[PDB]
Structure 1
Amino acid sequence: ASNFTQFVLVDNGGTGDVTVAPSNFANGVAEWISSNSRSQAYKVTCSVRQSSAQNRKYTIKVEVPKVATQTVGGVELPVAAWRSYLNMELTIPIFATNSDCELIVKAMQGLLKDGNPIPSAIAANSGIYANFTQFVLVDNGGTGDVTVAPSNFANGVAEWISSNSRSQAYKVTCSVRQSSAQNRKYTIKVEVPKVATQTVGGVELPVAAWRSYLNMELTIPIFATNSDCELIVKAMQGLLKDGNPIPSAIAANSGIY
């Protein structure tokens, strides 16, 4: 309920906090503003939309403006010269118990943790970026964890499904390419499956609702570098961080308000 609390997007350390005021957006989505004007601040969207018939989506965008003086006037107009668009339509179950979403929430914070894969990849912007990595999607805590390795490499578009079948494990996809004369994209689809209401496979399973389709389109301009890209990552993880309104909504099978 009303998880609209002013949470810090980028946990830099206290200085220059990208603190974002909640409560906003029109026709079905969410928002979280930072302390500046309508051209240099950070955008943080999050909408709930019943994708199909048994699987509801979660469109969640997050902008990462480059805080630099505009080069089109020579005045003090605060605006970004380029932005790091972060899209992610995370599908999800609904009639399953509350602990099912916790499994998917950790499946988002664990995807971006301090000293982990993607977070330290897209952060250097080059000797590592774009996408395909590994991480225990569900960080349960010593027992019940989900391991997930890789295999195929067709046309440079990978697809990884966990320690189960090619039709019953935590799958994730992606791809990068120079779409035009200036930008690039990170189509990191993270189809997060659900496996809750269970101890360790103790029959009391009766789970419900099938999958999620976390399709992502992270456009990163060629004007970025190492430093500005670590900020892009901190925007992705500071998005789905425990206790924050973005993942907490996705935790109770609920929006925000």
Structure 2
Amino acid sequence: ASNFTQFVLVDNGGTGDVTVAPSNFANGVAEWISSNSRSQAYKVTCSVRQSSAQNRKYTIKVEVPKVPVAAWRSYLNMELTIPIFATNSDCELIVKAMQGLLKDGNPIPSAIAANSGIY
């Protein structure tokens, strides 16, 4: 039973899916790399650090290039501070906020998908 496993990153129909695979877990920092050339690969990390006495502070990073070298590359960098008092009924509520934030139709993923700001 382990979650350092292979997961689908881009749900692109059922044919052109980009399924990313685990690569490295050095220094407590996870790393996923898609199965292609290294310069043309997606990259997902994850790390949890006890920042202070009452916080845990996640770190997720996603790098998406343009497709043998990459012309340019995107960079997601998101953090999540959760206190130690949050129960599992409250930790599932936080992930429901992130899934509801980026659901197809909401204004923030409809502004990223059209090179636009908030109008």
TM-score (norm 1): 0.42
Count of aligned pairs: 118
Q: Distance in 2 between matches of 1:254 and 1:209?
A: 22
User: Contact between 1:185 and 1:219, CA under 8 Å: does it hold in 2?
Assistant: yes
Q: Distance in 2 between matches of 1:208 and 1:154?
A: 25
Cα displacement string for residues 25-46 of structure 1 (whole angstroms, at most 9, x for unaligned residues): xxxxxxxxxxxxxxxxxxxxxx
User: Contact between 1:239 and 1:246, CA under 8 Å: does it hold in 2?
Assistant: yes
Cα displacement string for residues 58-84 of structure 1 (whole angstroms, at most 9, x for unaligned residues): xxxxxxxxxxxxxxxxxxxxxxxxxxx
What's the % identity of the aligned pairs? 98
Highest Rg: 1 or 2? Answer: 1
SS of the aligned residue for 2:23 comes to coil
Question: Which runs of 5 or more residues in structure 1 are unaligned?
Answer: 1-129, 195-204
Which structure has the higher relative contact order (CA within 8 Å, separation 6+)? 1
User: Contact between 2:19 and 2:34, CA under 8 Å: does it hold in 1?
Assistant: yes
What is the CA RMSD across the aligned residues, in angstroms? Answer: 2.8
Question: Which runs of 5 or more residues in structure 2 are unaligned?
Answer: none
TM-score (norm 2): 0.85
* Deviation (angstroms), 1:219: 0.5
* Deviation (angstroms), 1:239: 0.9
Change beyond 3 A, Cα 1:168–1:137:
same
Q: Distance in 2 between matches of 1:220 and 1:131?
A: 20
Q: Larger helix proportion, structure 1 or 2? A: 2
Q: Distance in 2 between matches of 1:180 and 1:131?
A: 26
Q: Tell me which stretches of 4 or more aligned residues in structure 1 moved more than 3 Å.
A: 130-135, 205-209
2:33 aligned with 1:171, yes or no?
no
User: Contact between 2:8 and 2:18, CA under 8 Å: does it hold in 1?
Assistant: yes
Q: Larger strand proportion, structure 1 or 2? A: 2
Change beyond 3 A, Cα 1:209–1:237:
farther
Cα displacement string for residues 8-33 of structure 1 (whole angstroms, at most 9, x for unaligned residues): xxxxxxxxxxxxxxxxxxxxxxxxxx
